[PDB]
């Protein structure tokens, strides 16, 4: 990975909210993957700034490879997991878990 793009976690009160800052790359060049508890932020960004670099006044954008992993809390429900994008930055919706509903099991014969 060449540049770590900016995250905000959130903690609502039945989900988890990730959002990303990764503009100029269309959503569906967007792998973000959940595997074994553990959600994954993945893709390249190319800027026009080294196939033509010398026509270029002035660079500050980053550009490159990026690879954000994160862990998931215990609370959260992989199976649900949705995701969207608009304007350049990356919602990730997390849901929870349901808690467990308290039974008494009754016994057979």
């Given at each position: 990975a060449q540049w770590v793009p900016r995250v905000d976690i959130k903690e609502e009160p039945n989900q988890f909210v990730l959002y990303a800052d990764l503009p100029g790359i269309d959503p569906a060049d967007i792998e973000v993957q959940m595997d074994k508890g553990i959600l994954s932020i993945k893709g390249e960004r190319?800027?026009?700034?080294?196939?033509?670099?010398?026509?270029?006044?002035?660079?500050?954008?980053?550009?490159?490879?990026?690879?954000?992993?994160?862990?998931?809390?215990?609370?959260?429900?992989?199976?649900?997991?949705?995701?969207?994008?608009?304007?350049?930055?990356?919602s990730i919706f997390i849901?929870?878990?349901?808690?467990?509903?308290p039974r008494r099991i009754q016994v057979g014969n």
């Open positions: 190319k800027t026009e700034s080294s196939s033509q670099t010398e026509h270029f006044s002035r660079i500050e954008r980053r550009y490159g490879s990026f690879h954000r992993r994160f862990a998931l809390p215990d609370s959260a429900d992989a199976d649900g997991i949705t995701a969207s994008g608009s304007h350049g930055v990356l849901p929870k878990r349901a808690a467990t509903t």
